[PDB]
Design a binder for this molecule. Structure first.
Ligand SMILES: CC(=O)N[C@H]1[C@H]([C@H](O)[C@H](O)CO)O[C@@](O)(C(=O)O)C[C@@H]1O
Ligand SMILES: OC[C@H]1O[C@@H](O)[C@H](O)[C@@H](O)[C@H]1O
Ligand SMILES: OC[C@H]1O[C@@H](O)[C@H](O)[C@@H](O)[C@H]1O
Ligand SMILES: OC[C@H]1O[C@@H](O)[C@H](O)[C@@H](O)[C@H]1O
Length: 504
């Protein structure tokens, strides 16, 4: 083995991890440091003592400390599991720097969490972070060597909440975030309820929603909107818009996997609408026949094999044209997709396709440029070219397209993300979310592209660690809502900030 293992008895081993998830004001029992014993305290043990450090700056920002003890070693803050993780909570005065528990109180458990309640104040600047470190763990007065695997650094944001966490509602997993703000200010958050594992269609997957009518301060209980009915009969990959008439429209796929779809046995595209701010939804309407396959009225598309619209959001143009970008498989000989805009000029009654927007594309998004042109951002799938994100432009409201290399300059490890057109210090810019990588789904970042200089900013990492798909919206009061896949076993996390919190 990698280490020398002695033969004079059993050896307890202690591992610790500092936490780096984001936080927000007033949150309760936020983990700062996790400590794991390799085995239960031995039968004759009487006490464990944990000593720690916590800088004045962090002390000033918390209202209370605790030691939590659990039989489970959890990834996220213990309240995020809604009781599915059992734990006891032992208060510590915020000024103290040591705490002790009897072995009887520990009751055989191995997992300890130094946690804090967060106060009401913050600057939200890049440097506005919370930290602590466990400095000693002693059993019956005998210290143990600590293996430190990460430092603690929790950034304060104006809002931070995991909206879908593994195990919620009985679903093992969650993926594929979509966020919509309506004109009346309602927030609709949807996801794939990946009930048995984290894998894609053709697994059995449902679509789930939560809603907020207070700007994301509080969220409704999750509701299953579309129920999967078995393998090959699931649903997922939601994108959302609100039409000019006010109705909400969700588009999604169901059925077999993307690469299993064929013209005669497709993975289908469905739409559903809500006329009451997402409280109720119409039964899913299959619109596959407008796109491809056996029932399509255009014989030139009746042998196309598959199509899916990119999860997250579409775009409703000033004209009222409703758009989503589809990635379409035109040949069964190749694992290649081409992008086309799927659009409706009649509030979703009928749907048409643009001319081809991008060859060898993948999930793509739209945004409205200051002068009315439409910008497409296309996922780079298969490490093409220089591993950069791809872009294209339309000046005819999405009907025809030309590649726009002048917008290229950010790396894409091959992942969905989102755009917002913003104005900052009088300048028209694009905010784009993607993982930073490089070459992997790590470090969820945002970048600003300055339209006039044609240059991208350095990235700002919003959420360090494993990070994948993201969607973003602009709240009415100027805040940005950023809805991201955090972690290897994903939770979908809604983070609120203003641009100056990240770029100032
Ligand atoms: C309908 C469908 O399959 N959607 C899935 C897409 C596509 O497979 C790829 O974009 C095709 O290249 O990719 C994911 O698996 C991914 O990369 O995390 C998630 C998403 O659920
Ligand atoms: O023996 C039980 C142990 O409990 C500890 O708290 C103490 O510091 C040790 O000296 C030892 O007495
Ligand atoms: O107010 C009643 C509702 O009626 C619907 O037709 C419309 O989509 C909504 O935006 C809302 O107007
Ligand atoms: O990598 C940093 C973090 O992001 C994920 O990977 C995971 O949930 C955490 O265990 C941690 O590893």
């Amino acid at each position: 083995g990698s280490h020398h293992h002695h033969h004079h008895g059993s050896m307890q081993e202690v591992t610790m991890w500092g936490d780096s998830h984001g936080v927000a004001p007033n949150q309760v029992r936020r983990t700062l440091v996790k400590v794991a014993l390799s085995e239960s305290l031995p039968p004759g043990a009487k006490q464990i003592r944990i000593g720690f450090s916590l800088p004045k700056e962090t002390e000033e920002k918390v209202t209370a400390l605790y030691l939590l003890v659990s039989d489970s070693l959890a990834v996220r803050d213990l309240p995020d599991y809604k009781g599915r993780v059992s734990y006891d909570s032992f208060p510590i005065s915020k000024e103290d720097r040591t705490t002790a528990l009897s072995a009887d109180s520990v009751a055989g458990r191995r997992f300890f969490y130094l946690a804090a309640d967060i106060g009401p104040v913050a600057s939200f600047s890049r440097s506005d972070t919370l930290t602590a470190r466990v400095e000693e763990v002693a059993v019956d007065g005998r210290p143990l060597p600590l293996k430190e695997l990460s430092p603690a650094s929790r950034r304060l944001y104006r809002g931070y909440e995991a909206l879908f966490v593994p195990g919620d509602g009985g679903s093992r997993n969650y993926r594929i975030p979509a966020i919509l703000k309506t004109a009346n200010g309602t927030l609709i958050a949807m996801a794939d309820r990946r009930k048995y594992n984290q894998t894609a269609l053709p697994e059995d997957i449902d679509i789930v929603m939560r809603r907020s009518t207070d700007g994301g301060k509080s969220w409704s209980d999750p509701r299953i909107i579309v129920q999967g009915e078995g393998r090959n009969h699931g649903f997922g990959d939601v994108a959302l818009v609100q039409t000019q008439a006010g109705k909400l429209l969700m588009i999604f796929v169901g059925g077999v996997g993307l690469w299993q779809s064929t013209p005669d046995r497709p993975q289908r595209t469905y739409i559903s609408e809500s006329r009451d701010e997402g409280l109720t939804w119409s039964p899913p309407r299959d619109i596959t026949h407008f796109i491809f396959g056996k029932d399509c009225a255009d014989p030139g598309r009746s042998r196309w094999l598959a199509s899916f619209c990119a999860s997250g959001q579409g775009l409703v143009l000033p004209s009222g044209r409703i758009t989503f970008v589809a990635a379409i498989r035109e040949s069964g000989q190749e694992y290649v997709l081409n992008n086309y805009v799927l659009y409706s000029d009649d509030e979703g009654d009928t749907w048409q396709l643009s001319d081809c927007a991008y060859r060898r594309g993948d999930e793509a998004k739209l945004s409205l440029m200051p002068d009315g042109r439409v910008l497409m951002s296309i996922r780079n799938q298969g490490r093409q070219e220089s591993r950069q994100r791809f872009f294209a432009l339309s000046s005819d409201d999405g009907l025809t397209w030309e590649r726009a290399k002048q917008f290229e300059g950010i790396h894409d490890p091959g992942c969905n993300g989102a755009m917002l057109q913003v104005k900052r210090n009088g300048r028209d810019q694009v905010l784009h979310s993607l993982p930073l990588g490089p070459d992997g789904r790590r470090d969820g970042a945002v970048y600003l592209f300055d339209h006039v200089s044609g240059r991208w900013s350095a990235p700002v990492v919003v959420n360090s660690g494993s990070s994948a798909y993201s969607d973003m919206t602009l709240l009415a009061d100027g805040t940005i809502g950023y809805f991201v896949e955090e972690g290897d076993e994903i939770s979908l996390v809604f983070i609120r900030f203003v641009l100056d919190d990240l770029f100032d």
